[PDB]
């Protein structure tokens, strides 16, 4: 959550969390997240539950684009950068980072892939650098009219409007197939 640097959306970085106790109450009551939309699990219900592992996929998008991060949602980013499964179970967190990501002159460090031949499968990360081909004639390789770099830069500005203000997004994904990472609670002696 407090990472010094956040990976680009086209290279959204996914981390593994296991063998620990996750206290989601502090996250829920922090109130610092523009976002805590939880699908399949009530946000104030994960303290009694637990899972095999937690998948934390972190990236950065525009504030207006955060909506595209949802199951069964159609959009450029949701289709060619990060697609969630229709039956996704987990929770999406989004919080504004304008002050930590916007600088005078345009912060172009954030990049997002736009053009792709086919829509991405769920949780499919595409790092291909191939030049998108919108014409019958392959270029092999001089970019130009209608032959493409498939990536574009956000160019966040300090004065950019909200829809254009940066937002750091972390998607927590859970799968239940022995329990490893369980939240906060106590044990008792066995009785037969």
């Amino acid at each position: 959550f407090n990472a010094t640097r956040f990976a680009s959306v086209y290279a959204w970085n996914r981390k593994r969390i296991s063998n620990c106790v996750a206290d989601y109450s502090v996250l829920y009551n922090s109130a610092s997240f523009s976002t805590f939309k939880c699908y399949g699990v009530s946000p104030t219900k994960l303290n009694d539950l637990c899972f095999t592992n937690v998948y934390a996929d972190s990236f950065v998008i525009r504030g207006d684009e955060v909506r595209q991060i949802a199951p069964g949602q159609t959009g450029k980013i949701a289709d060619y950068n990060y697609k969630l499964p229709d039956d996704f179970t987990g929770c999406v967190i989004a919080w504004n980072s304008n002050n930590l990501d916007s600088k005078v002159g345009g912060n172009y460090n954030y990049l997002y892939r736009l053009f792709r031949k086919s829509n991405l499968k769920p949780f499919e990360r595409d790092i291909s650098t191939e030049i998108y081909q919108a014409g019958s004639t392959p270029c092999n390789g001089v970019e130009g009219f209608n032959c493409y770099f498939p990536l574009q830069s956000y160019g966040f500005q300090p004065t950019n409007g909200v829809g254009y203000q940066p937002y750091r997004v972390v998607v927590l994904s859970f799968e239940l197939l022995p329990a490893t990472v369980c939240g906060p609670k106590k044990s008792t002696n066995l009785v037969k």
Epitope: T35, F36, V66
Partner: nanobody, 120 residues
């Protein structure tokens, strides 16, 4: 299909009052819950207040309780935040967000350019 525009900010003395407006356009029927949040440059997002349009229930940040009041005008399709006894801590950009349901902070979206309030 839903737009929210914030207005009514400005510069006031400590202990002054301002009255911030969130005008909504489009088909806002689905969004029952509306919230006001603020962000100073250095700090992160915080929700000052939220209201349930249908029920009328309200929630307030502990700091703002007593000084801030949230109201709505259905004919105007606007949600209003009344700031009394403004304090220097109140200085930040203010925006209004909206969502179908109140469980989480994200489902609120559609917030506009925002309004700047400075207390000095």
């Amino acid at each position: 299909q839903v737009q929210l525009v914030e207005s009514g900010g400005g510069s006031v003395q400590a202990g002054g009052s301002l009255r911030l407006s969130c005008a909504a356009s489009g088909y806002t029927i689905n969004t029952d819950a509306v919230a006001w949040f603020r962000q100073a440059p250095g700090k992160g997002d915080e929700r000052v207040a939220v209201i349930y349009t249908g029920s009328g229930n309200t929630n307030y940040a502990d700091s703002v309780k007593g000084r801030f009041t949230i109201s709505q005008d259905n004919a105007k399709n606007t949600v209003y935040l009344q700031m009394n006894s403004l304090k220097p801590e109140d200085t930040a950009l203010y925006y209004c967000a909206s969502g179908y349901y109140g469980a989480s902070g994200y489902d609120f979206n559609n917030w506009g350019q925002g309004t700047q309030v400075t207390v000095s």
